[PDB]
Symmetry: D2
Subunit: 261 residues, 4 copies
């Protein structure tokens, strides 16, 4: 079928890409980076993230694969020494697919802008103090003062979510997790402190109190949005699909990355 | 139908219990504490927990209700001023039920003992050092040294789980969460640190390294088990069912208990 | 003697300032905001911080006093209802002085810039990743990857230091405390995680690895420094002196602000 | 002078001890374990702790030395390959001494019992709930509910203190640090959460609310004390003295143990 390969652009990744294309030429496989059904990422998790966002249009028509030419990654989880075996079973088709949930971020102005995130989306202030009211399913939950907030996908919990004390979540759980960044807690102000895990269809809304300008990140991308009226988080109806050629459990992936490998 | 009422045993709880029984006498309602289908708890969450464990036999035949005569609780979430309205709609039946997941704990010796937990189950050492190997779905994940571990139900995440830095989890998520107690982390030993959230059918197994005696707690109950070979945690196939007479969202319950009420 | 009064600029603070000046006119007291020996701050801790930095020149010639017209502050710790009693004992002189330590921050380029901080000084990246090597007393201690670092004075430990998990430190301890912001810890990278408390004469040096542009804050002030070669932290030889008219222990001040008042 | 050597009792430690005694026989050195002025510990930090408590009587008459036959320790910080060079410079005398602060723990009943701790002292409940009022310098600071509390010496901050989120403190700072274990924080109850660092002469007193039986630990030793009226912590007037034969900075010791070695 159709396929494309993105590369980190260093020496080993470009050469591994050319070898897989050459190997792909020995099968009923066509290179098309416009409407591929198999996107192969070569490099790191950042290379995978760029591949994911490049094709966020046709998510339900693509199965992704990540190859790590550096250290092990949670998305680029196949060693380069596995490329030739990868080439063959991709071309013979008839492989299993696994799907991970995604996080929808809606930004509303005084207009609307929506975004899809594979790792997480964060909100910080444009320089001054960051104060927002946190509204869960239309109920006002808390007034947050601090550096910012982070809403994470399940598979995103091993990234920035982990650095803020959030929990690690198996990606088969359709959920999103919200964590705090350096929150102020005293006798006047109060935050929950604990990370919060939300199921499907629960809507978390951030609403400004004074400053209406926020630095909003979605995975690697980060833009200052002006005159923001609301930020809305919820588990996405869309999922990312992976090609599954071997058993590599999420908890083993977590172990190899943090305990020992 | 059949029903029973348990009470904390102070003055207000006993008197509120006698008033509800008297109010119940005005309907087609029979007091039976052997095979009730409605268990009403009056007191605190601890009173509710005792009620839950008293009838862990016929869980799929009981709808629980908690009334708090003290501060608000996550299970005893109906004010005493609501007892008379509670009496009427319980007797007229035709109410909605909601179900929360439970945590199964299997203890194996050199024999087997299983337990059901509504909040959490914890493991500590019998005095000396606590060292266990943590095995997730037969894969060895880590060797834990510290004070102990805690596996929490979703609704249990607001209790002991919360005090250890775990995340708060909406009880509609069929999951369990494992947290660490004062873990040793150095150049020799390594723990994940982060709390871990497990879905249904994932089995977490604790296995001793040297000391085979552990203090194991299940909700309020705590017993020293001797010559333990394995502790096994997994989300239970059984659920606890609540009678639902009004909208009281879990996040509002969390807000009222920790932010302000 | 000479004195000046700074005000937050709202209605109550300006009026309380004019009342104290009028009360001061009944004594041997001269208003001079160029070479005062008593600086009175009216407003919040932020008002006090501006007063401190306005006169960082003649620190060993000034005794500061803070009055809070809002909530209680750690520097503005005298209620407005105490202004008239404040006026009298300030003019009669013969009061006790107490001194708190300060933090010296040296910035070196490819030139040198030094700063004094009453609360803390923080370092973040100019947008990209923040990576620095941490050098303690010329010994390379760690390579830090994360959002940033924070070095706090003793009295500064109740501010930003507290929000990052640092310890609260009695201001009679001549020390500085370094805390981490959302550090990445895996199998490749390693940080201490724990906050570190440094005594007098211990020099902590931050050195860039790739990006040489950092956003450096000193109390309220925050500037992007370009082509930074080194950031150097150490306990200052200068101290800030307070006028002491009553017993108000630091731990009571901490209690009133965080537990209950 | 007089000296003694304690050993962990395995094969290498006993043999290294006999070699040092034999090496000591070639100098003006006498083995006396009753009134030694040089106590040499061979094994781990636990071996050192037993040596410290064995001679807590004549602390101001002893210089301690620790040799690690296992991994590096914060007190047993000299490799076994250094024993013969150790023997010579110990016998030639004329070495430098360094001193670390200690923590005094006073227990009062309805009688008095005092203890000296090199690492830390902890308080937990005898089984039921642990509730104590925390009194700082006679001022009531907080009512603590949780698993327990831990007061740590400076050098003790790398042990249990570190596992609870406390800060690492250079041992030249005459201080003590108090940390919380799994504290309950809600709308009814309030703890500071943050670790607290206390200077010399600040007295921290724990006072029971209901249960008057506590499990109190002092370094390795742990005893259930009955009918406790008060627990009192303060920096000790006594210090432990080390023999200093080389530069081994505390921060390098911290680095080697937690970052890499
Ligand atoms: C090291 C480093 C920087 C972050 C790498 N990274 C990315 Br990108 N996505 C990640 C993920 N989902 N889980 C863990 N790590 C991730
Ligand atoms: C205050 C106090 C002691 C714990 C009360 N408690 C119990 Br019992 N179950 C609880 C729960 N599920 N969520 C929150 N709190 C809970
Ligand atoms: C509320 C709020 C914002 C921070 C106020 N604040 C300032 Br400014 N200095 C502070 C200090 N030293 N200790 C505690 N709080 C402080
Ligand atoms: C590994 C392990 C168990 C604790 C060892 N240990 C002891 Br004993 N005292 C210690 C200390 N002061 N700093 C760090 N570690 C210490």
């Amino acid at each position: 079928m159709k396929y494309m390969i993105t590369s980190k652009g260093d020496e080993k990744s470009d050469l591994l890409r050319l070898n897989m294309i050459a190997g792909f030429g020995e099968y009923d496989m066509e290179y098309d980076d416009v409407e591929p059904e198999i996107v192969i990422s070569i490099g790191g998790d950042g290379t995978f993230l760029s591949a994911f966002h490049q094709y966020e249009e046709r998510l339900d028509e693509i199965a992704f694969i990540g190859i790590h030419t550096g250290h092990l990654g949670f998305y680029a989880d196949w060693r380069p020494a596995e490329a030739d075996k990868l080439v063959k079973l991709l071309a013979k088709g008839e492989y299993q697919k696994v799907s991970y949930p995604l996080l929808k971020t809606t930004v509303k102005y005084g207009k609307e802008a929506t975004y899809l995130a594979l790792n997480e989306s964060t909100v910080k202030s444009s320089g001054g103090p960051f104060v927002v009211d946190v509204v869960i399913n239309d109920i006002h939950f808390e007034r947050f003062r601090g550096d910012g907030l982070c809403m994470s996908t399940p598979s995103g919990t091993t990234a920035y979510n982990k650095s803020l004390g959030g929990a690690l979540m198996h990606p088969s759980i359709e959920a999103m997790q919200l964590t705090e960044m350096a929150s102020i807690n005293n006798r006047v102000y109060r935050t929950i402190g604990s990370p919060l895990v939300f199921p499907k269809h629960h809507v978390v809304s951030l609403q400004p109190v004074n400053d209406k300008d926020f630095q909003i990140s979605v995975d690697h991308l980060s833009i200052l949005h002006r005159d923001v009226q609301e930020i809305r988080y919820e588990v996405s109806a869309k999922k990312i699909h992976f090609a599954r050629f071997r058993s590599f459990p999420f908890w083993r992936r977590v172990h190899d990355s943090f305990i020992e490998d």
